[PDB]
Amino acid sequence: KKHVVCQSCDINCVVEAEVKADGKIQTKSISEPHPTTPPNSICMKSVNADTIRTHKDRVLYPLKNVGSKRGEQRWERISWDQALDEIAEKLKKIIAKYGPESLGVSQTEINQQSEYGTLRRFMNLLGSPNWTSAMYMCIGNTAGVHRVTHGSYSFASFADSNCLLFIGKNLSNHNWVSQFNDLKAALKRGCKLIVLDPRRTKVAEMADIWLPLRYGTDAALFLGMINVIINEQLYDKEFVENWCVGFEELKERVQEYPLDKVAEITGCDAGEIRKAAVMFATESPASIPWAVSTDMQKNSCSAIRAQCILRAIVGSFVNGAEILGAPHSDLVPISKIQMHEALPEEKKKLQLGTETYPFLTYTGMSALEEPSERVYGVKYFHNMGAFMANPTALFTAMATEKPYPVKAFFALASNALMGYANQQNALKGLMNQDLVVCYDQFMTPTAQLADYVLPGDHWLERPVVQPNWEGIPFGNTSQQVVEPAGEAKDEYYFIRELAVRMGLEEHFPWKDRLELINYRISPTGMEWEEYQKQYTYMSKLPDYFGPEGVGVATPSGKVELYSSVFEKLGYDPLPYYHEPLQTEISDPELAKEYPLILFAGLREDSNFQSCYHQPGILRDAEPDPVALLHPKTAQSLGLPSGEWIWVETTHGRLKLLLKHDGAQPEGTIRIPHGRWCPEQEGGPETGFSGAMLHNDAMVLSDDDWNLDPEQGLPNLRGGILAKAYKC
Ligand SMILES: Nc1nc2c(c(=O)[nH]1)N[C@H]1C(S)=C(S)[C@@H](COP(=O)(O)OP(=O)(O)OC[C@H]3O[C@@H](n4cnc5c(=O)[nH]c(N)nc54)[C@H](O)[C@@H]3O)O[C@H]1N2
Ligand SMILES: Nc1nc2c(c(=O)[nH]1)N[C@H]1C(S)=C(S)[C@@H](COP(=O)(O)OP(=O)(O)OC[C@H]3O[C@@H](n4cnc5c(=O)[nH]c(N)nc54)[C@H](O)[C@@H]3O)O[C@H]1N2
Ligand code: SF4
Numbered sequence: 009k010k011h012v013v014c015q016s017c018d019i020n021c022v023v024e025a026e027v028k029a030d031g032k033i034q035t036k037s038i039s040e041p042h043p044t045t046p047p048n049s050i051c052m053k054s055v056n057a058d059t060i061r062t063h064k065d066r067v068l069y070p071l072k073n074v075g076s077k078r079g080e081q082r083w084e085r086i087s088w089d090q091a092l093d094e095i096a097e098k099l100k101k102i103i104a105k106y107g108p109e110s111l112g113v114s115q116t117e118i119n120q121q122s123e124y125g126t127l128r129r130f131m132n133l134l135g136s137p138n139w140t141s142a143m144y145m146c147i148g149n150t151a152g153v154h155r156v157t158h159g160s161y162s163f164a165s166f167a168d169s170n171c172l173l174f175i176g177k178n179l180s181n182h183n184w185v186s187q188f189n190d191l192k193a194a195l196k197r198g199c200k201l202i203v204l205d206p207r208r209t210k211v212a213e214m215a216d217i218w219l220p221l222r223y224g225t226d227a228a229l230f231l232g233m234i235n236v237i238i239n240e241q242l243y244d245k246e247f248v249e250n251w252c253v254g255f256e257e258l259k260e261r262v263q264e265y266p267l268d269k270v271a272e273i274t275g276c277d278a279g280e281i282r283k284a285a286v287m288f289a290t291e292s293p294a295s296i297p298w299a300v301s302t303d304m305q306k307n308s309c310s311a312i313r314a315q316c317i318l319r320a321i322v323g324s325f326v327n328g329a330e331i332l333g334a335p336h337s338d339l340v341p342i343s344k345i346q347m348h349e350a351l352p353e354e355k356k357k358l359q360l361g362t363e364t365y366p367f368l369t370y371t372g373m374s375a376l377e378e379p380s381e382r383v384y385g386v387k388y389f390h391n392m393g394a395f396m397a398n399p400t401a402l403f404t405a406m407a408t409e410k411p412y413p414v415k416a417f418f419a420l421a422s423n424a425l426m427g428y429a430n431q432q433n434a435l436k437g438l439m440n441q442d443l444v445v446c447y448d449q450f451m452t453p454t455a456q457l458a459d460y461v462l463p464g465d466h467w468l469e470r471p472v473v474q475p476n477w478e479g480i481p482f483g484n485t486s487q488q489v490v491e492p493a494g495e496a497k498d499e500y501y502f503i504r505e506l507a508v509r510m511g512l513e514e515h516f517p518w519k520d521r522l523e524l525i526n527y528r529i530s531p532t533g534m535e536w537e538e539y540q541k542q543y544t545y546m547s548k549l550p551d552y553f554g555p556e557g558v559g560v561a562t563p564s565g566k567v568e569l570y571s572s573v574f575e576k577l578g579y580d581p582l583p584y585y586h587e588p589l590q591t592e593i594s595d596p597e598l599a600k601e602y603p604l605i606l607f608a609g610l611r612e613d614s615n616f617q618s619c620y621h622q623p624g625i626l627r628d629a630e631p632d633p634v635a636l637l638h639p640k641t642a643q644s645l646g647l648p649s650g651e652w653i654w655v656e657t658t659h660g661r662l663k664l665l666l667k668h669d670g671a672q673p674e675g676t677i678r679i680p681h682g683r684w685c686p687e688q689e690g691g692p693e694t695g696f697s698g699a700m701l702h703n704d705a706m707v708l709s710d711d712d713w714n715l716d717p718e719q720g721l722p723n724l725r726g727g728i729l730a731k732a733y734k735c
């Protein structure tokens with residue numbers, strides 16, 4: 009029996025695995041008392057993970073495209089050695105012609121947990137700043153906002169909270185089951201629960217207060233709560249006095265958001281919003297667990313800022329409710345391995361997005377350099393995901409060659425075609441590449457567009473030392489269950505082999521991933537054989553707020569309720585809510601043709617993002633891409649529940665199976681993210697196995713009107729109008 013960090017989704021429950029006599033790997037909830045993962049924390053995605061590891065369609069060998077047009081499905085198996093030789097040769101030619109900045113990378117490291125900083129190390133040595141990640145609108149953006157406010161991304165304590173505030177978070181036995189169990193434990197301790205969700209979910213039913221707000225309006229709801237907490241003086245006067253700046257300015261701002269106005273905006277009742285605010289401030293320690301919905305709105309910046317402000321002012325950073333992370337105290341920081349200082353300033357300045365949405369770039373984050381050196385001993389603190397190219401800028405440079413060409417593109421555990429907005433432009437960008445490399449487990453829609461598809465190992469085939477989002481104040485060890493199948497290799501193998509061919513061997517002394525793991529843990533004096541024997545290693549953290557506290561990694565050293573960085577960048581230093589530019593409020597005329605407010609998302613028990621749609625048990629649990637309409641709404645449109653429809657915005661459309669569902673509020677429509685059809689032939693004739701027909705990014709604009717102005721991420725949750733009609 010092994011303890012393994014499940015990487016079938018990103019919450020990373022620790023499970024137990026065992027190889028049975030017939031070679032099948034059985035996974036189950038950990039039978040021992042685990043320090044972080046509560047009992048009975050395993051879901052169908054994990055239970056059935058071996059059906060993916062052993063799937064007949066898994067790519068186990070390097071494939072070279074031998075067609076005459078990108079996207080043509082004509083593939084020939086080659087060796088790793090030959091693939092790497094050819095990739096390096098072509099990349100050298102591309103870089104000689106277009107500069108190292110012409111290499112773009114989309115990487116989801118949480119899916120791989122294998123490179124330990126060596127990916128950005130490689131890019132920084134080559135001279136490319138053009139790294140991005142689908143986490144540009146999930147956690148990575150949030151960390152930027154947290155950093156300008158209080159220097160580091162915060163973590164909410166389910167164990168210590170006496171009040172939890174949920175934004176969406178449709179937790180269940182198959183959506184972040186460990187956290188589902190954490191919540192249940194909390195409730196039984198007497199912890200109160202406040203749920204903001206237009207959909208009455210199971211967590212909404214469990215809630216002490218359920219606020220059925222209108223899609224997209226969380227920022228307004230939170231401003232209303234801050235109004236109540238400031239005006240009622242329910243805040244922690246000592247923390248505000250000693251550790252915050254800009255409180256008087258914040259106080260003035262929230263007078264713009266009285267409960268009568270917020271009630272009108274949100275569709276919630278004023279008295280309920282007040283109860284929520286009061287409960288949150290008085291039922292300490294009170295936390296707001298990170299939630300995706302507010303990373304995906306036109307008002308995302310303000311909604312995130314407002315959450316940070318709420319936690320700060322009620323005392324959550326000093327009562328155990330919210331913890332400010334750091335590079336792990338026991339380990340060599342990933343940030344240091346990444347060698348951001350090696351990338352020349354000239355190349356940092358070129359990072360795509362610097363000229364449009366600089367906030368999350370090296371340039372936008374630069375005011376945090378000295379503060380980060382001071383507090384964390386790391387000038388370039390790669391907190392969760394950081395120093396990022398803006399995806400719209402990246403795909404636009406790929407597609408148009410402006411402001412300059414990007415001509416090589418690597419997708420590392422990232423179905424990049426489908427992982428952002430404006431999927432048509434991502435396709436155009438990919439079709440204008442001279443080199444595309446896809447490191448994955450399957451012939452995904454993105455891999456279908458590659459010159460080379462390289463087989464990645466699976467989480468049941470690798471050891472892992474955590475944390476692999478730098479900032480998380482603990483790491484769980486993951487044991488290797490089996491050797492990788494076929495010729496699947498680890499992410500560091502790929503990076504090192506390429507680095508050597510690019511002339512960078514001297515900077516990559518670790519001969520394999522195990523040596524790199526041993527380097528990551530080297531300050532402990534242990535090697536991996538000994539290290540893996542303990543489940544969890546907690547990090548020490550700086551003394552932020554004690555009597556001789558060091559404060560936070562912000563320009564002022566204090567919690568910036570009024571953000572100096574935003575002021576600097578020309579953005580509103582304080583949170584606000586403006587109606588998205590495509591709603592029934594901002595555009596009632598457009599709403600005559602497009603009567604539905606759009607929500608793209610709603611995670612499904614049996615799949616993770618675009619993963620696990622291959623024929624099998626998981627696909628069978630939810631086999632079609634499904635639209636959800638309230639029965640009354642569907643009825644009005646003449647669409648029988650269970651019939652195929654198009655859902656169309658001003659940007660584009662996708663095809664879905666209408667299922668009527670009374671929990672979906674009237675006049676709103678759900679579309680899924682990540683849906684495609686791996687059973688189909690690939691290539692453009694099938695829209696890349698249905699990608700072009702069934703993915704939400706087909707209908708999501710990334711014009712400026714649909715971008716968060718400060719972060720440059722796309723709005724997905726409210727703020728967009730749609731129509732639905734029969735196929
Ligand atoms: N339009 C839109 N975009 C979104 C979202 C949305 O709802 N809508 N969701 C956003 C959010 S919240 C997140 S967190 C991100 C998620 O983004 P990702 O986690 O990147 O998810 P996918 O886009 O499905 O691409 C993941 C790819 O990783 C491959 N893979 C899985 N495990 C491994 C492995 O061990 N090794 C290798 N080499 N490959 C592996 C899968 O086969 C898959 O092709 O997407 C974001 N992007
Ligand atoms: N099975 C499975 N589990 C997963 C994932 C998966 O793909 N599959 N993905 C994981 C990842 S990467 C993420 S980011 C999380 C996301 O986890 P969740 O937050 O659970 O995200 P969803 O399931 O997309 O939507 C949950 C609720 O958010 C609500 N919602 C939508 N828009 C808004 C809004 O504007 N305001 C408010 N208050 N609520 C809104 C919806 O009505 C829905 O009920 O799930 C994780 N867990
Ligand atoms: S929620 Fe399920 S898929 Fe995600 S880490 Fe936990 S067991 Fe794995």
Ligand code: NA
Pocket residue numbers: 409
């Ligand atoms: Na051209």
Ligand SMILES: [W+6]
Pocket residue numbers: 146300
């Ligand atoms: W996510």
